[PDB]
Design an enzyme around this catalytic site. Sequence first.
Site, PDB file in Angstrom:
ATOM      1  N   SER A  47      -8.018 -13.861   2.512  1.00 14.76           N
ATOM      2  CA  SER A  47      -6.726 -13.564   2.198  1.00 14.76           C
ATOM      3  C   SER A  47      -6.013 -12.231   3.092  1.00 14.76           C
ATOM      4  O   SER A  47      -4.867 -11.851   2.878  1.00 14.76           O
ATOM      5  CB  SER A  47      -6.500 -13.009   0.609  1.00 14.76           C
ATOM      6  OG  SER A  47      -6.684 -13.960  -0.180  1.00 14.76           O
ATOM      7  N   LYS A 185      -5.223  -4.820   3.436  1.00 14.23           N
ATOM      8  CA  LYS A 185      -5.384  -6.050   2.832  1.00 14.23           C
ATOM      9  C   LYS A 185      -6.912  -6.478   3.031  1.00 14.23           C
ATOM     10  O   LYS A 185      -7.478  -6.410   3.725  1.00 14.23           O
ATOM     11  CB  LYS A 185      -4.578  -7.114   3.694  1.00 14.23           C
ATOM     12  CG  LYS A 185      -4.676  -8.590   3.042  1.00 14.23           C
ATOM     13  CD  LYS A 185      -3.859  -8.662   1.576  1.00 14.23           C
ATOM     14  CE  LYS A 185      -4.017  -9.803   0.770  1.00 14.23           C
ATOM     15  NZ  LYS A 185      -5.227  -9.290   0.022  1.00 14.23           N
TER      16      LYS A 185
END
EC number: 3.5.2.6
Length: 235
Positions: A47, A185
């Site tokens: 991701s 992230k």
Amino acid sequence: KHLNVSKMNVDDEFKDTDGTFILHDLQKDQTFVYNRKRANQRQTPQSTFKVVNALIGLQVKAVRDEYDVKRWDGVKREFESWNRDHTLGSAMRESAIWYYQALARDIGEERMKTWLHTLSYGNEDISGGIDQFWLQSSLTISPLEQETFLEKLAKEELPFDKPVMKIVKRMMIQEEGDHYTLYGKTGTDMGLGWFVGFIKTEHGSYVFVTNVDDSGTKAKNITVDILKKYGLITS
């Protein structure tokens, strides 16, 4: 008393974890690397690819802005925070894969491949499928290559529109303190964990990349511990 990243040591934070850590001081132009061999090994981005997906999606107007709503279809997926209406920004925050799969399908193969070629994004291999290639699939990238890309994003030395780059960086904000802003992230799969991003303080601005043989949560915790140790995360 200002940080010299070349004098850092992060052995203690990695005592029981196999991994790599990169911290780049943007203003002095100086880099610290722990475990350079692992920093050179390509792995699936998982991701962390949402950063790139968001940049390309905004650039080609497949989504409007960080508030572009896609309604949940009502299917119960693996995490409760996925089971709700999402925007581009909330799906990044909660790592709602289904939103970014719909986005990738709208971007399409040609635009995805072309823009990915501008980022020097690892092996740039999307042959695993338009909405699967970043998920334990064909695309791989090393931690050093992630750092190079994120440095260009921080400096806005990429062929994206400048407002697009500012929107994506804003979507990465994880913590806004009195004295610092943490951007990041995570990614996770099969015992490989990422945490990549930025930290801005009152005295500097940095890019970091962490990759471990553990979860993305562990990668983030190691990163936060290092940034706390060296006084970049305070309050």
